[PDB]
A paper describes a structure:
Here we report the biochemical and structural characteristics of [name] and Cfl2, two Cif-like epoxide hydrolases from [name]. [name] and Cfl2 also appear to utilize a Cif-like His-Tyr epoxide ring-opening pair instead of the classical Tyr-Tyr pair. While Cif and aCif exist as constitutive dimers, our hydrodynamic and structural studies revealed that [name] and Cfl2 exist as octamers and decamers, respectively, by forming rings of dimers.
[name] amino-acid sequence alignment with Cif suggests that Asp123 is responsible for the nucleophilic attack that opens the epoxide ring. To test this hypothesis, we expressed and purified a mutant [name] in which Asp123 was substituted with a serine ([name]-[name]). Although hydrolysis of R–SO by the mutant formally crosses the threshold of statistical significance, the low absolute level of hydrolysis measured is unlikely to be catalytically meaningful and is sharply decreased compared to the wild-type hydrolysis of R–SO, consistent with our mechanistic hypothesis. The four epoxides vary in length, number of double bonds, and the position of the epoxide moiety along the hydrocarbon chain. To that end, we determined the crystal structure of [name]-[name]. Data were obtained to 2.15 ​Å resolution, although the UCLA Diffraction Anisotropy Server reports modest anisotropy (2.2, 2.5, and 2.3 ​Å along a∗, b∗, and c∗, respectively) (Strong et al., 2006). The RMSD of main-chain atoms between wild-type [name] and [name]-[name] monomers is 0.2 ​Å. Closer inspection of the mutant enzyme's active site shows that, apart from the [name] substitution, the active site is largely unchanged compared to the wild-type enzyme (inset).
Residue numbers in the entry:
A (entry chain E), D (entry chain B): 11 to 304
B (entry chain G), C (entry chain A), E (entry chain A), F (entry chain G): 11 to 303
Write the structure that this text describes.
């Protein structure tokens, strides 16, 4: 019992930091904490999110010794918004480059929504470099669950069409990001969240270029589908964990992951909606720790 | 006494929780706190309000062991905004289905403004399920006080006309929810309230569809008048308490309740306007807790 | 057969002129034509209108030798927008001062909507100076037809409440005058009108102060009610004509007028809604010419 | 050759009239011309259109002795915008009540977009009352052409999702009706049209309630699918003509119609996009007169 | 003598047609007239322009038997606005694909501003296919005239910096296209132009995506610089004409062209600023007809 | 290390004060703290900043007994926005007149961006009055580094062109100061800063006339180039310290200072971008305090 408590968890400010990494043309923003020599855990948000969605998971990961890296991927948050490169395979290259610049070679990888597609493209292109992979909330293109949501005309993906209308989507939503994003979020949540927390996301997507860059993730879905379907001719060898809330995709995250990897295990969060990190960070943190422990 | 203190009362975060209930068509948002096994007290806000109007009534209420369920009814606050179902009788059915969901099956009902019409419609359709009922601040359709406000062209119900203009009302007020709602509120209050508290209501009604959903409550008034007139031909058997501020509807809130229910008692709040839960919670809780003994 | 033809009728531009009259504080705008020596016919528009509503009536009146004066009353159109003076009795004084300044003293008087209240106040205060009075479309305050629309909560006066909200009405409608007024007009019309014609009205009410000044006509209704009830203790002695469309107030214009005058005759416009000069000017000009002859 | 010529054709003003029909609670606006005693031809526009889309077709129909009735259906143009009644079967009832008020019982019926769904529901519910039916540009719900566009996630129906979002669609598009509708239109045309003509439609949809009422046609699609599938158990007996542009649906209007009626004939307009009355009224006028003489 | 006459020249409407060409991903809009069998002349506008800038040149070309094709290149006017492909070499590929789709393969080519960069990239990549090339008003990247404007910080390219700011440029200029573009045009003109003509351009750049697509032409300049410097290791073999107004770049169009081609001839337009087709179409058509003959 | 901490440092309220100084034309706003009798340290911000950029440098500075005077120069922050005087030399004269007002007559000067041009112009015109001088972050006009940024078309000075467009820059950015300034800032930083701190700058430049006044600083650049070139023919006699972040101008801030002054020393701040007082105050104060021994 208790009303929603907005903001970063107590003491977060003291341990975690905001940092920037210059890559070949693109600058990525990320939040990193924990011991510098520890096993690196890279966390990838989705749409419409930033690194901030991991605010309640990052402390616990770091309190078990890991080197936490929460990335604003290309086009999101405080990261640069280049013209293109929003297909998920190339965005995985951005994350790999960041990781290499931070001195690492093998990483644990957690992604949700758009971020779990980037994470999969990371594991598919450089499988030796991903020790363990955690897949949250959303199916990846190329899977059967994905093709079904599309062929059924699933009401939950009504926005795929709109987001893929270049310039039109931006013209409609500019100036109404808070109203559009708060409604998008609340229709898919089950645990009550604080408006001040969701407004952190909405305000990021109101910054110049943030709407456009976010929508280009959706505009690359056809290219991602063709690319990911080729990726799925070699199932992943590393251990994979699949999680989703019972009031949204649930079990279908584990069904989806088993089309992509040989070593799969999964759980469904009780009384939890689409935003696992926002709604049920305790369940998520534990599952990641039990999963990341040998 | 001193200046208005905005926000939830101290310690409120710790004791209450926000929850959702999925019904067939609609998902309803509600706030609860206190022991689970206790007698349930259902609170129904009005226009232009949310559950937040009971912020000073719910703590004390469930410090005495009551199960407090403060509901955003269909279309308000964080609840869904469906196409229809905005007649007050069907809205009562939504509240019953949520009550049934929570495991209860008989409760104590308190309502003001639109909520008191829902609260009455609840008691009228399922008399057995309402232990008691507290009518606050506003008369219900079908009563004489309601019909006399209409015949008087009472200055206070000036907004009935505008709110009943579909699309026109939304077009005029969209983007001006704060200015419209703060003025609507301050013109009907007597105790000075904080802008920050009124802005909580205004911001909810600025949300997508919230203007339309609230205005459809007014667009259903003719249907409610016919329906409530049928309900009042069977006077309520339960004890009923009527309260209103002396600067607004005063004692005709009591007179209105006598038209509907047999076992009625009432009081008039001193130096308080239209918004009893906001203006004088102290008088109100104290009145509620005694009534609830 | 035919699509609506917007604008002034052919030849209007060469026969009529826009003019201003400076009174002691207020400058009034008016359009005039016909012989300088002819019997003067004063035409008073209402809300949301200007002199332009008489555009299809004025040529025929001028061809029959009448001196046509279509006035933008205080606060409307191109006239000044003073702070006050929007009670109808004082606005009749404005029209009388302009009439005296043009060298006339006895006049034929035609009014609709707000203008028929001004026109009645003119006739009640100076009955010897009004030769004949024609009353269109809307009842005047103080009559039982007026009180009956109010007590019934007639849907067609929903806007009384909103317009009487000082500052709120202006804030809601500023910048949306075209949408608000076009909708107001079409919901009450029966003959299809051209949007370009109604926008001439809407554009006038978008000019600085025009919204405020027009709503002050509505904010003065209680004072008009008290003032007109005293006027109605003495029925009007001059001949009176009552007209309205069969699809709007119809015969109630004649019922309303018989409480106001001893010598009343009336007719109902066929296939006509609320805007007699806009919808059926052919019927209106014929009835006026026969009445004034 | 020639540049686009905007507006009504010469002489239109003296030959047609704007009229209203009061139904039991809703008022409908329509434009009518031609002989009072002639065979009635009812024309039903779609989204985002009004009667004005038939401006180049109504003169030729009326000069051949037909009584033309181009209707703004419920919620569109100058018609009333009630709360409900936006399922296509009920909207056909509105059209029938207005035809009956004009003294007619037998009509030729032409529809496109949403109007062809109303026109089909008219013929399905009162088949004896429809002499001939012409179906333009768009498939109706329940057909497999309709169901295959849905299962493909066909890019040309991207807007079905957005339009079905109550309040979100109105909030995003209010104040941008011109930019939204001009783009919607030009992306589906092949013949160059004048901006002034499309703006006539866009300005109608900027009117109070016109966006909401238009989107409720789309929010009623599930109910239309159930209702229309039942309608197609009994194929239509009257002669049916199917037309579409080769650069849009083309021959699939012809396939779609053959699932609905026994006596079907069709043609495909050359070098024509989605908006047959706007783009190639010469072809359409020729096709309708030949069909109505037959 | 004469005030500026806005719009298309008389008879243009009956002689030319707007058409679309679907390429493999992009649909291009273009205006064409003259004999279907004539030698094809392709005209490429720049920023902030559309095909409409050739309105006073196309009739004379068509009367002399040329097949006129005035193209809205990728991202401009009524053409599609794809995500990328705004480097000038790829945009030349778009124009070539449209030319091949119209049944032609050898063409006369005219370009100004961005279009002269596209036109040069066309000639550099497919020199056998360009019969003659006419270069107007603006230097192309890679030349010393281009580098000299950059190193000098020429005030006339102040906008390069702003247009290369992705998302920032769009946010600043969205909704103010008319003020931004009219000012840009008049500061560089010498002959007075009609505001209605320039607004045809401004209104195009206000349509969805048009601002973004046009600025991507500027954001591709570094890539164009690298690509064109490689192209300039082989001077163009076909005849080249260089033109600019005496009040703008003047003889520097001929200096720039001589770094690009072996066979170059040039002239300077009298009493002409930056917009040769808008300001002095009479001089431009004469020079083009003599060059192509 | 951890997350950015927005606002003034703890205890700041207590130790510093806001004051105004009326000069002949203009009133200047400035912040001060520390002992009155101490050596005065003058701080000059740049674009787009106010005194607030020194919030982490001024405390420590005057904990060592310095007299800290952080000035909003002519046109910035809470200072007046006159018509002219935006060449950097005259702005130095304004700073001197304020220094004279405060009773001092020789001081220590620290400046960045526009302030370092003012600070240099101060030392150039009255060499005797400046004890020492710390140049931060930006090269001054007339130097080679300045001239090479112009010839390179350095991507960082993209805004010189736009800011030099009178009325155009104000029209584009008015109402978009926060989005424009936050982006301008974050693109040039390396240490992550809080939006709340950057918004303080943005809100000042949203004030009436603040956009115009700041942009006139850029519109005077050609005049400053001529004036500073004259000043640099007499190399400065005072000790000069040059600092810049390694991710921005780095060591050419030192190279730039050697062009102007004889006794120069410098350092380059590690892992810091363009905004030394904002990004690494710690390195900066420590560097300043040592230099100031």
């Amino acid at each position: 019992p208790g009303m929603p408590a907005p903001g970063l968890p107590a003491g977060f400010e003291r341990r975690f930091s905001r940092r920037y990494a210059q890559l070949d043309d693109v600058r990525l923003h990320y939040v990193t904490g924990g011991p510098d020599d520890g096993e690196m855990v890279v966390l990838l948000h989705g749409w419409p999110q930033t690194w901030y969605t991991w605010r309640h998971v990052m402390p616990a990961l770091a309190e078990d010794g890991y080197r936490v890296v929460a990335v604003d991927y290309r086009g999101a948050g405080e990261s640069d918004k280049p013209l293109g490169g929003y297909d998920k395979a190339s965005m995985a290259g951005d994350i790999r480059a960041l990781v290499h610049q931070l001195g690492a070679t093998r990483i644990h990888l957690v992604g949700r929504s758009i971020g779990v597609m980037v994470a999969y493209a990371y594991a598919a292109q450089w499988p030796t470099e991903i020790v363990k992979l955690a897949m949250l909330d959303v199916p990846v293109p190329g899977t059967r669950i994905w093709d079904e949501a599309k062929a059924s005309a699933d009401p939950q993906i009504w926005h795929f069409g709109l987001h893929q209308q270049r310039d039109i989507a931006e013209m409609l939503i500019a100036g109404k990001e808070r109203a559009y994003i708060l409604d998008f979020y609340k229709k898919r949540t089950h645990v009550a969240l604080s408006n001040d927390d969701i407004a952190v996301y909405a305000d990021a997507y109101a910054a110049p270029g943030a709407l456009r860059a976010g929508f280009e993730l959706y505009r690359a879905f056809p290219q991602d589908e063709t690319r990911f379907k080729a990726f799925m001719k070699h199932k992943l060898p590393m251990p994979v964990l699949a999680l989703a809330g019972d009031k949204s995709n649930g079990a279908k995250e584990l069904d989806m992951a088993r089309e992509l990897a040989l070593d799969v295990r999964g759980a469904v969060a009780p009384n939890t909606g689409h935003w696992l990190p926002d709604e049920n960070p305790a369940f998520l943190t534990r599952q990641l720790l039990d999963f990341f422990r040998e």
